Structure 1
Amino acid sequence: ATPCIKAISPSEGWTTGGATVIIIGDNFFDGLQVVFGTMLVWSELITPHAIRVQTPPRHIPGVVEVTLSYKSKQFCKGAPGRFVYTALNEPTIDYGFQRLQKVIPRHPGDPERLPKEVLLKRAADLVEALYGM
């Protein structure tokens, strides 16, 4: 009757945290906590087979073990969930945004530096016109 993790969805998120994640498994109950590496968060019980959490921030990117905890007892250490944190400022991601900043078309009224949301919006507009539909 111990809580067990069978799957986690999504399995990745940004280091800034705040993503909704569903943990699927067995023997869940109200009050169960979830630990991402060392970062503990509380959960919402959906059914005994699913709980919902918001990811905690993590200082560094990388793979973490996801385990469960209740009254400081750890569960799932022998079969932990896997969750991957990515940093928006990882050098290869950042270099991609720097490339886009130089060639994304600027529209009247734009700020001097286009925000990343806009770089991505217009890159997708352009790629959709090439390969979309």
Structure 2
Amino acid sequence: HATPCIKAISPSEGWTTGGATVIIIGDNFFDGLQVIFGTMLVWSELITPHAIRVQTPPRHIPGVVEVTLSYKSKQFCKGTPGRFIYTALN
């Protein structure tokens, strides 16, 4: 299908303080594609039609989150969500 799809993300770990640049790669990306990162909608930008750059949001609490894709307030469910582990320095 031509539905947006995440292959992998790097880095897949980051501090709770956030702000680190994450690259999401996969299939069928387009400008306007929204990225949802631990439930927060983040600013994003296509590097190519196969790569997206986002900054990690801050997160109150350490642990695994999902990275998913959405457009016009409607999420896509093709494939496997990106997985990102927040860690606390503290």
TM-score, scaled relative to structure 2:
0.92
Deviation at 1:37, TM superposition (A): 2.0
Assess, with a 3 A threshold, how the Cα gap between structure 1 residues 17 and 77 changes in structure 2: closer, same or farther: farther
Assess, with a 3 A threshold, how the Cα gap between structure 1 residues 26 and 78 changes in structure 2: closer, same or farther: closer
Q: Could you say which structure has the higher strand fraction?
A: 2
Deviation at 1:36, TM superposition (A): 1.4
How far does the alpha carbon of each residue in 1:31-77 deviate from its partner, in whole angstroms, 9 at most, with x for none? 11111121110211111100100011111110001101111111247
Give secondary structure in 2 for the equivalent of 1:67. Answer: strand
Is the 2:13–2:86 Cα contact (8 Å) retained in structure 1? yes
Say which one has the larger Rg: 1
Deviation at 1:78, TM superposition (A): 5.0
Question: RMSD of the alignment, in Å?
Answer: 1.2
Assess, with a 3 A threshold, how the Cα gap between structure 1 residues 50 and 38 changes in structure 2: closer, same or farther: same
Partner in structure 1 of residue 3 of structure 2: 2
TM-score, scaled relative to structure 1:
0.63
Assess, with a 3 A threshold, how the Cα gap between structure 1 residues 78 and 86 changes in structure 2: closer, same or farther: same
Q: Distance in 2 between matches of 1:50 and 1:4?
A: 11
Q: Distance in 2 between matches of 1:10 and 1:86?
A: 13
Assess, with a 3 A threshold, how the Cα gap between structure 1 residues 54 and 68 changes in structure 2: closer, same or farther: same
Number of residue pairs matched?
89
Unaligned runs of 5+ in 2: none
Is the 2:21–2:53 Cα contact (8 Å) retained in structure 1? yes
Give secondary structure in 1 for the equivalent of 2:64. Answer: strand
- How high is the sequence identity, in percent, across the aligned residues? 97
Q: Distance in 2 between matches of 1:61 and 1:77?
A: 27
